[PDB]
Amino acid sequence: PQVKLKEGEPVDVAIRRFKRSCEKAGVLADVRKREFYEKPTQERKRKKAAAVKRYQKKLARES
Amino acid sequence: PRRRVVAAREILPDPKFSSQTIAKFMNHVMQDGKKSIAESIVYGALERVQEKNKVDPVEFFETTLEKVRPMVEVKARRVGGATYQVPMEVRPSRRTALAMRWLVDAAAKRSEKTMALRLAGELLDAAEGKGAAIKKREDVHRMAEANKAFS
Amino acid sequence: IDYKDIDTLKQYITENGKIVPSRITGTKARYQRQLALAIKQARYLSLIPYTD
Amino acid sequence: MNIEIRTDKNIHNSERLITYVRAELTQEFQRHSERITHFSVHFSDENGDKGGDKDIHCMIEARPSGLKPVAVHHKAGNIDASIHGAIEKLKRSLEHTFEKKE
Amino acid sequence: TRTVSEGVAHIHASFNNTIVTITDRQGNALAWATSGGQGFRGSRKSTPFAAQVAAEVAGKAALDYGLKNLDVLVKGPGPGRESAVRALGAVGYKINSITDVTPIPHNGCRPPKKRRV
RNA sequence: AGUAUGGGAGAGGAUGGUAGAAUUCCAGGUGUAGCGGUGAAAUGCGUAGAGAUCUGGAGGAAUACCGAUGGCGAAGGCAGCCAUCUGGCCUAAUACUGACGCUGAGGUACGAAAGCAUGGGGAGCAAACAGGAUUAGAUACCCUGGUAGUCCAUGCCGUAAACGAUGUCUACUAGCCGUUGGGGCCUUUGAGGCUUUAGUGGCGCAGCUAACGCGAUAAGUAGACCGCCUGGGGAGUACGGUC
Numbered sequence: 001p002q003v004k005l006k007e008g009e010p011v012d013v014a015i016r017r018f019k020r021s022c023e024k025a026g027v028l029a030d031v032r033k034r035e036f037y038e039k040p041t042q043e044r045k046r047k048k049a050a051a052v053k054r055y056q057k058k059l060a061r062e063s
Numbered sequence: 064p065r066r067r068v069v070a071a072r073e074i075l076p077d078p079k080f081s082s083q084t085i086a087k088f089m090n091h092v093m094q095d096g097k098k099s100i101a102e103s104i105v106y107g108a109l110e111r112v113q114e115k116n117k118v119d120p121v122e123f124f125e126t127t128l129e130k131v132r133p134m135v136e137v138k139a140r141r142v143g144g145a146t147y148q149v150p151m152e153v154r155p156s157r158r159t160a161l162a163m164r165w166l167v168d169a170a171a172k173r174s175e176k177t178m179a180l181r182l183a184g185e186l187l188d189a190a191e192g193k194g195a196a197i198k199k200r201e202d203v204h205r206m207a208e209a210n211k212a213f214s
Numbered sequence: 215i216d217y218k219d220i221d222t223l224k225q226y227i228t229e230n231g232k233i234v235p236s237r238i239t240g241t242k243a244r245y246q247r248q249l250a251l252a253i254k255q256a257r258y259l260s261l262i263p264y265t266d
Numbered sequence: 267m268n269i270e271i272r273t274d275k276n277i278h279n280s281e282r283l284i285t286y287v288r289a290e291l292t293q294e295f296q297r298h299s300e301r302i303t304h305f306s307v308h309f310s311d312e313n314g315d316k317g318g319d320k321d322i323h324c325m326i327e328a329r330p331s332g333l334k335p336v337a338v339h340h341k342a343g344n345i346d347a348s349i350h351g352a353i354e355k356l357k358r359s360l361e362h363t364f365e366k367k368e
Numbered sequence: 369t370r371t372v373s374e375g376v377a378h379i380h381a382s383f384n385n386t387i388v389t390i391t392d393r394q395g396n397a398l399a400w401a402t403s404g405g406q407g408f409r410g411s412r413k414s415t416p417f418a419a420q421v422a423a424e425v426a427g428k429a430a431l432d433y434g435l436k437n438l439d440v441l442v443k444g445p446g447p448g449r450e451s452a453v454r455a456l457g458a459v460g461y462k463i464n465s466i467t468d469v470t471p472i473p474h475n476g477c478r479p480p481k482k483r484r485v
Numbered sequence: 486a487g488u489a490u491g492g493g494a495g496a497g498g499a500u501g502g503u504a505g506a507a508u509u510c511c512a513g514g515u516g517u518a519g520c521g522g523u524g525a526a527a528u529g530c531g532u533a534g535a536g537a538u539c540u541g542g543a544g545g546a547a548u549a550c551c552g553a554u555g556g557c558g559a560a561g562g563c564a565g566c567c568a569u570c571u572g573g574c575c576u577a578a579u580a581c582u583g584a585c586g587c588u589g590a591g592g593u594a595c596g597a598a599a600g601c602a603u604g605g606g607g608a609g610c611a612a613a614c615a616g617g618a619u620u621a622g623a624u625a626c627c628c629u630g631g632u633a634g635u636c637c638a639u640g641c642c643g644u645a646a647a648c649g650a651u652g653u654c655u656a657c658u659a660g661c662c663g664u665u666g667g668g669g670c671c672u673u674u675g676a677g678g679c680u681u682u683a684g685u686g687g688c689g690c691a692g693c694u695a696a697c698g699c700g701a702u703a704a705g706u707a708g709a710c711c712g713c714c715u716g717g718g719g720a721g722u723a724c725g726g727u728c
């Protein structure tokens with residue numbers, strides 16, 4: 001983050017820029033994961049499902 | 064309904080004062096289609112209130128109505144098995160309708176001999192700032208203020 | 215790749231200090247592995263920050 | 267809850283039957299109490315003046331305070347059997363509905 | 369009594385509650401407020417409205433020293449992250465910058481178990 | 486089928502050391518009312534200074550991003566970084582042995598997690614257990630605490646939906662598109678396009694199948710050997726015997 005406000009920078013626009021920077025960084029998403037313990041079986045299942053979805057999206061793209 | 068947008072009907076202005084607001088008030092007072100008795104009641108009340116202080120009856124009525132109109136209300140929202148009373152703004156038509164209904168009900172529950180007398184008493188009380196309609200306005204503000212937190 | 219080529223290593227690091235994925239960098243897997251190893255070694259030697 | 271039980275010409279009804287039905291039905295459904303305001307049971311014999319394995323039809327319909335009225339039917343060879351089957355089915359139905367509505 | 373030219377805002381936002389702490393540099397505290405403290409008990413405790421109300425009260429309380437510049441440090445998830453900072457500016461403060469301080473474990477301790485609600 | 490010599494990739498295995506993030510506990514600076522939790526609550530924590538915030542110590546456990554239809558291993562299974570010891574695999578040419586092979590009743594070795602014996606450690610999590618809620622009832626789901634255990638050393642235990650539910654080895658039989666590790670060729674604008682091989686994926690002709698579906702990673706066409714089935718229960722049970 002470490003976003004520095006400009007001399008004429010509105011506070012609302014600065015907040016918007018901070019939100020965009022945080023969204024790109026993705027630090028907020030990582031926090032939600034630590035709320036629960038994900039077991040290895042569930043983790044592997046979700047990763048394989050995501051891989052299948054990505055490959056399907058790719059195929060649809062060049063198709 | 065699930066479809067369509069029903070248009071509003073037109074209420075003709077009253078004979079004496081040519082006021083659509085006063086005609087709507089007479090319609091609120093009216094029972095069993097006895098609009099002639101409704102007009103008699105309303106006009107007797109207006110004469111009685113005019114007697115106390117010399118002002119335009121129409122102006123007095125609209126001023127008291129503005130005094131009694133609501134600001135904010137909640138509409139119950141059922142999510143997660145809870146009431147979730149959510150404050151919201153209300154359209155001018157609803158504002159006027161609730162104001163008129165409160166005035167008429169408070170007059171009905173007052174304790175004078177005739178409906179005209181007790182309606183005039185309610186108008187005077189609302190003008191002063193202490194009445195049953197004023198109390199319902201206060202209560203709705205109080206509750207929508209307690210629940211301001213939600214959107 | 216070397217842990218001493220700090221400029222090249224920093225070309226593939228975000229502001230937070232995290233290693234940028236091969237998907238968006240466009241690097242080969244072989245290059246990415248060595249890049250990560252060099253980044254870790256430089257982090258240990260403090261040539262580049264771990265975080266922030 | 268008020269109980270209104272009726273039969274047909276074949277079945278034959280008596281105030282003794284009324285008292286017994288009221289007592290048993292209240293005893294079984296005593297838990298709900300205020301949740302429910304009205305019961306109406308009905309008894310028939312279908313092919314009146316003949317016989318069969320079931321040959322008798324019991325019904326019970328109950329009004330729960332709030333939700334809409336709910337009905338249950340049963341067929342059995344005897345009045346007692348019909349009543350017991352209908353009671354069991356009502357109990358199951360009310361339990362399911364109350365669990366659903368929570 | 370003590371006069372400080374510059375300040376630091378700490379906004380600890382959680383699903384349940386939001387806390388705003390105005391401090392000076394080196395960590396010594398000046399003022400603090402909480403959504404539950406400014407009324408708003410229950411599910412409404414997490415509403416962003418309570419967040420900005422708490423920010424308003426805390427900033428007004430801390431304005432006594434007259435500091436005109438501060439930097440915002442925002443921690444945790446939950447509503448109020450933006451409402452509190454907007455209220456900070458609304459109070460009359462000038463925010464130097466806004467930054468995030470969320471603690472991210474590098475696969476350390478084991479999180480709790482699922483809620484099979 | 487195997488041996489010698491050059492290179493290459495890799496969370497393959499054992500031992501030791503070390504880095505940062507975060508959690509908990511303990512002291513101190515500022516400071517004065519809530520914190521925490523839930524569908525809503527309550528239990529609980531805090532005016533004997535809680536929560537938030539800054540600084541300084543103790544110890545434990547696991548290694549964010551990289552990270553992937555990625556990689557390695559007979560299987561079970563392997564994730565920071567460095568050093569030591571160590572097995573297998575891929576790839577090229579030359580030179581050697583001359584069928585030295587496949588399978589394998591018994592037997593023997595390895596074998597997730599839980600559990601057991603002895604001695605250590607204990608941050609977080611959490612069987613049992615206690616309280617608070619919900620409920621007609623709650624011996625549960627939810628909340629607040631919490632012991633064994635989870636961790637280390639040396640042994641035992643022989644079990645899993647230990648699963649592509651698909652034994653190992655060998656030869657042959659349309660094509661199209663990915664990705665990983667090597668080999669070769671041609672353009673070049675310092676990157677590309679075609680080929681062979683060993684893995685890992687998505688489609689699909691013929692063929693097979695009750696169907697679904699499989700389809701050069703066969704469930705196709707053939708051969709060698711082993712294990713196993715004979716209606717659902719009683720029943721992986723009783724008796725005897727081994728551990």
Ligand SMILES: [Mg+2]
Pocket residue numbers: 312313
């Ligand atoms: Mg008939």
Ligand SMILES: [Mg+2]
Pocket residue numbers: none
């Ligand atoms: Mg008939």
Ligand SMILES: [Mg+2]
Pocket residue numbers: none
């Ligand atoms: Mg063999």
Ligand SMILES: [Mg+2]
Pocket residue numbers: none
């Ligand atoms: Mg054997």
Ligand SMILES: [Mg+2]
Pocket residue numbers: none
């Ligand atoms: Mg528990």
Ligand SMILES: [Mg+2]
Pocket residue numbers: none
């Ligand atoms: Mg060891």
Ligand SMILES: [Mg+2]
Pocket residue numbers: none
């Ligand atoms: Mg053993």
Ligand SMILES: [Mg+2]
Pocket residue numbers: none
């Ligand atoms: Mg078995």
Ligand SMILES: [Mg+2]
Pocket residue numbers: 647
């Ligand atoms: Mg397995």
Ligand SMILES: [Mg+2]
Pocket residue numbers: none
């Ligand atoms: Mg099997």
Ligand SMILES: [Mg+2]
Pocket residue numbers: none
């Ligand atoms: Mg046995």
